[PDB]
């Protein structure tokens, strides 16, 4: 068969819907900008080949073989490493306080932009402004120090009232206007996983890949907008001092594992919920490359518009947002819409398509934790199915009121550097060691050929045993020695947040020896005899 372009339209656009996330649109432009642009792109293309793609391919192979969720994949592999799945459930609780709040900030801009007069265009004493210059060159205003744009003033005081909180040690009350905005999101999420029928259908077209093809028109505006020739040069600076000892590779380790999928246990249920594809080496290789390609375009439109800020402020590109945290997307897109001619209508379009692109990473993102826990109470879910799906939403809601307060960005950064960085990286290390150093690559190599019939490459077989556990161990060894301290919104850091940071990073690390110590005294025999009886797989 030739398999002409009639399949190519149906296939390639369906890969885009499974690739682009908010980790490719929101996380990646900000993680290039935290450690200096250009210095991140070259460690991005090396860590993805050596550490991202072989772990992206490993979880899809074990999903089609054992046909279970990530809680109960390990019972057919090694029964003492069941706490890895419990480490997935305790990390995914921390993501629901980290990732659902960014959705709550996206729907708030949709409500506050029905007016023909956009609030981003001026700082006209509307809610809380002052020391602001809206017209950069439209009313020949020169730029001075300690000045803020109205695109930043609309964020830093309207939606997230930062000045209410003096720091991380003192948080205010609860904002009534934002807490009712996240309530509408969890209503849609609960009314979407109520049945959960999505394997390969045509809902992937409208939900994800059609908002992406309309998001690419922002790059057309950035070409017309000035400062682009001095803007895109900052993204492509290959020379940087000491990319081996500083510790910017954990910014690459956390970004790749948040964008591709492995680490969060979402791939062990996604490859178990479909059928035998028989093209896993040819589908996941295209998907993992285009996931960096759908993130390269979104990592290119942001620094183009930030060159327009650096041009009319007469400052450096790294001088524009020196201490601005994870809200770089809600400032760059805040200015890039107001400079368009159709600023009123396109603000509704560009933000509503950002909502549907984020919900697909949540409607299918909960598949790694809801489907996986179905294999633990088999005789209970016949009268529990209305309860625990509702119970996990309310539990994640009540765990998210620590960051729906006025000091929101003081908690979102803490759940980014410590809850996503080392915690997902450690679980992905134990997932690779226990499948190769303990379960053995000999049994795993015969399991791939049963579903495919094609032998894995000699370049691939050296990765899961020696190469990929070496890079994951070097980053953790470089993290415990180096101070993880950063700076955010003219606030240095408190010293007690660092000790709090390692407590969150070891909150998932403590669950894995807990289940191993649970298997200590419950088995009889000699101490050397109890171990072999514990690591022996089950019998059907």
């Amino acid at each position: 068969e030739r398999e002409t372009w009639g399949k190519k339209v149906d296939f390639l656009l369906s890969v885009i819907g499974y690739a682009v996330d908010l980790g490719n649109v929101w996380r990646f432009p900000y993680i290039c900008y935290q450690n200096g642009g250009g210095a991140f792109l070259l460690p991005y293309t090396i860590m993805a080949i050596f550490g991202g793609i072989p772990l992206f391919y490993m979880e899809l192979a074990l999903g089609q073989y054992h046909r279970n969720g990530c809680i109960s994949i390990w019972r057919k592999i090694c029964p003492i490493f069941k706490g890895i799945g419990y480490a997935i459930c305790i990390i995914a609780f921390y993501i629901a306080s980290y990732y659902n709040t960014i959705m709550a900030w996206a729907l708030y801009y949709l409500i506050s932009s029905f007016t023909d007069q956009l609030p981003w265009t001026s700082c006209k004493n509307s809610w809380n402004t002052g020391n602001c210059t809206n017209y950069f060159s439209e009313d020949n205003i020169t730029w001075t120090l300690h000045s803020t744009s109205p695109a930043e003033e609309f964020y830093t005081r309207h939606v997230l009232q930062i000045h209410r909180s003096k720091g991380l040690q003192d948080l205010g009350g609860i904002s009534w206007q934002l807490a009712l905005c996240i309530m509408l999101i969890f209503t849609v999420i609960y009314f979407s996983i109520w049945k959960g029928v999505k394997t390969s259908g045509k809902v992937v077209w409208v939900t994800a890949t059609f908002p992406y093809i309309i998001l690419s028109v922002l790059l057309v505006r950035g070409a017309t907008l000035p400062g682009a020739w001095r803007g895109v040069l900052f993204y492509l600076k290959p020379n940087w001092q000491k990319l081996l000892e500083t510790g910017v590779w954990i910014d690459a380790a956390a970004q790749i594992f948040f964008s591709l999928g492995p680490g969060f246990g979402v791939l062990l249920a996604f490859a178990s919920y479909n059928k035998f594809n028989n093209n896993c080496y040819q589908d996941a290789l295209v998907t993992s490359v285009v996931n960096c390609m759908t993130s390269f375009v979104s990592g290119f439109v942001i620094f183009t518009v930030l060159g327009y800020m650096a041009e009319m402020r007469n400052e450096d590109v790294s001088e524009v947002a020196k201490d601005a945290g994870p809200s770089l997307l809600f400032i760059t897109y805040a200015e890039a819409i107001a400079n368009m001619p159709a600023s009123t209508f396109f603000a509704i379009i560009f933000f509503l398509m950002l909502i549907t692109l984020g919900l697909d990473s949540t409607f299918a993102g909960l598949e790694g934790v809801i489907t996986a826990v179905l294999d633990e109470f088999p005789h209970v879910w016949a009268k529990r199915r209305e309860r625990f799906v509702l119970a996990v939403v309310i539990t994640c809601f009540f765990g998210s009121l620590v960051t729906l307060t006025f000091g929101g960005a003081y908690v979102v950064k803490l759940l980014e550097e410590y809850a996503t960085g080392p915690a997902v990286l450690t679980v992905a290390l134990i997932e690779a060691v226990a499948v190769s150093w303990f379960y053995g690559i000999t049994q795993f190599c015969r399991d791939v050929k049963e579903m495919l019939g094609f032998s894995p490459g000699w370049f691939w077989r050296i990765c899961w045993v020696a190469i990929s556990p070496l890079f994951l161990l070097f980053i953790i060894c470089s993290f415990l020695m180096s101070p993880p301290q950063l700076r955010l919104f003219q606030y240095n850091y408190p010293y007690w947040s660092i000790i709090l940071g390692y407590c969150i990073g070891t909150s998932s690390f403590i669950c894995i020896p807990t289940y191993i110590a649970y298997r200590l005294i419950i088995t009889p025999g000699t101490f050397k005899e109890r171990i072999i009886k514990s690591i022996t797989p089950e019998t059907p």
Partner: antibody
Amino acid sequence: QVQLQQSGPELVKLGASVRISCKASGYRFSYSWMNWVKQRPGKGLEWIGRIYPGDGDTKYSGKFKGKATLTADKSSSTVYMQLSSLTSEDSAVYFCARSAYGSEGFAMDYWGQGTSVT
Amino acid sequence: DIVLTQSPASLAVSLGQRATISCRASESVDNYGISFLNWFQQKPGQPPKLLIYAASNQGSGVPARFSGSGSGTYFSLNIHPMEEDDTAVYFCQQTKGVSWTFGGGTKVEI
């Protein structure tokens, strides 16, 4: 120290139209609002409207929604208040105050001498 | 058009005593912590002068004889070092939405 002066007193005909000048310099003109305060002799105060320079926005109190007209000019740094449908109650002292620079919205002690019309 | 009434009408002159004036905020709160409220002096014949902005900060050039307090509905005014020169009328203004208005005004005279 921001200089803010006004025009002189003017006479009032029945149902005529007036034009009150409000000159102010030494400050960023298209940065803040401009207040218009009505005060009858003996009575209290009353707010009329506001205007942001650069043809920004005009908000009225409701009593002068079609009776007052505010214009702005970034070149001359002056604003004008065109009144219509004059009566025996409109002849009073009018003020032209500059609003705050931001976070509160107060008056920055930048007031005029009062273009008293009668 | 949120109305506002001042609860006293006129106070006497006695040096070194308490003089407080409250405002009506039956449908009025503050949106961003810094309390949207103003205070103004106005001598007879003189244009109005700022006394206290944001109900807690000292005005520009005004000495420490005047200091405001309160949070929410009823707001205070400390005129405990009462001065003979302060024989004027005082006003109260809202700065929330398009609702800018003034109260009835309270004066002071022996």
